[PDB]
């Protein structure tokens, strides 16, 4: 066989530890899910520092007054949210965020509302998104890409055990923290779904073919998206692209992908099993679940526990320019925030 007795027992024991961890993680999640926290701060607890981005609300760098801590505050106009017909997505995003807990998930520290707005107060990662680092460097070497990919695999293993489908994996949504580890940030398309759902959502380059083809789909679309992400990290460009989204979709459903010649055989084989149109063969959707991915040859040198424990030396640390390095972001018109009580019942749960 491939494994002698010692290595087989080791892997067996490791996989039992995962189940035991997930059982307890589901317990902690469900309790916070059925009883979400609300109104854990107020606006006057913070000093406004810099608008960092602006539809449906803004995002500004704030500084807690009683602690000195910096946080990224998502400010959301209730009336704009009601008008964009975004009540459920807004409510559900905060409800997921306050309930989940994992090393590679951004943490919602506070949330509150006033008469005009909804506030989501996240821990502030000055590192910035993976997208900018990927475009700057060009492409990541396979060991560098593998380190990030391993973090996404564990995060999806955690989220899927909670029946959460993430649905918006892409470098734009991934931050590199000051230890060089991944933070997944945006949960606006995540959905708690046991079986199938049908919503056409995501980003064209990352859309699994069963979303494009208008059938129902399950969490296996996240494993496809992982395939896109790994390919893009190691190539510098995504596997499917064209001038217009329609031509992207045609390549996605064609069942053909081409690889740069610098891709290792192990990488190409992993990607052929992730970017697999046939759901009966897509890694992550099979009998062995996520273990087909974690045990793949491309991850042979990956110590999953050490990754989870953040004990592996990141291959890249963004330049730590202080807890308030607003010099990496574009300058925005610092528009004030006013409060006059609107949309009360729509946001009772927030």
């Amino acid at each position: 066989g491939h494994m002698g007795n010692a290595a087989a027992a080791k892997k067996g024991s490791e996989q039992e530890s995962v189940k035991e961890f997930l059982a307890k993680a589901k317990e902690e999640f469900l309790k916070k899910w059925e009883s979400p926290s609300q109104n854990t701060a107020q606006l006057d607890h913070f000093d406004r520092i810099k608008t960092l981005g602006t539809s449906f609300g803004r995002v500004m760098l704030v500084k807690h007054k009683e602690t000195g801590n910096h946080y990224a505050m998502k400010i959301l106009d209730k009336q704009k949210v009601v008008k964009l017909k975004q009540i459920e997505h807004t409510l559900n995003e905060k409800r997921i965020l306050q309930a989940v807990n994992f090393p590679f998930l951004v943490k919602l520290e506070f949330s509150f509302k006033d008469n005009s707005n909804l506030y989501m107060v996240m821990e502030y990662v000055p590192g910035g998104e993976m997208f900018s680092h990927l475009r700057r460097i060009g492409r990541f070497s396979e060991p560098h890409a593998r380190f990030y990919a391993a973090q996404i695999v564990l995060t999806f293993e955690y989220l899927h055990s909670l029946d959460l489908i993430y649905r918006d994996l892409k470098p734009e949504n991934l931050l590199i923290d000051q230890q060089g580890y991944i933070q997944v940030t945006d949960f606006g398309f995540a959905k708690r779904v046991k079986g199938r759902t049908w919503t056409l959502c995501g980003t064209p380059e990352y859309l699994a073919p069963e979303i494009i083809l208008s059938k129902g789909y399950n969490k296996a679309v996240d494993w496809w998206a992982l395939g896109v992400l790994i390919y893009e990290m190691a190539a510098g460009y995504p596997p499917f692209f064209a001038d217009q989204p329609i031509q992207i979709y045609e390549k996605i459903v064609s069942g053909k992908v081409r690889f740069p010649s610098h891709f290792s055989s192990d990488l190409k084989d992993l990607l052929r099993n992730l970017l697999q149109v046939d759901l009966t063969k897509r890694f992550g959707n099979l009998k062995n679940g996520v273990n087909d991915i974690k045990n793949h040859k491309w991850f042979a040198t990956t110590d999953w526990i050490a990754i989870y424990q953040r004990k592996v030396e990141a291959p890249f640390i963004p330049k730590f320019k202080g807890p308030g390095d607003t010099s990496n972001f574009d300058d925005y018109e610092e528009e004030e925030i006013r409060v006059s009580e609107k949309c009360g019942k729509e946001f009772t749960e927030f």
């Binding site: 056409l200 980003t203 064209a242 001038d243």
Partner: peptide
């Protein structure tokens, strides 16, 4: 080259959802 095609595609920037 594939890379040049990627540049010519106009989708090298941040990509919007939906």
């Amino acid at each position: 080259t594939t890379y040049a095609d990627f540049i010519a595609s106009g989708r090298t920037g941040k990509r919007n959802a939906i």
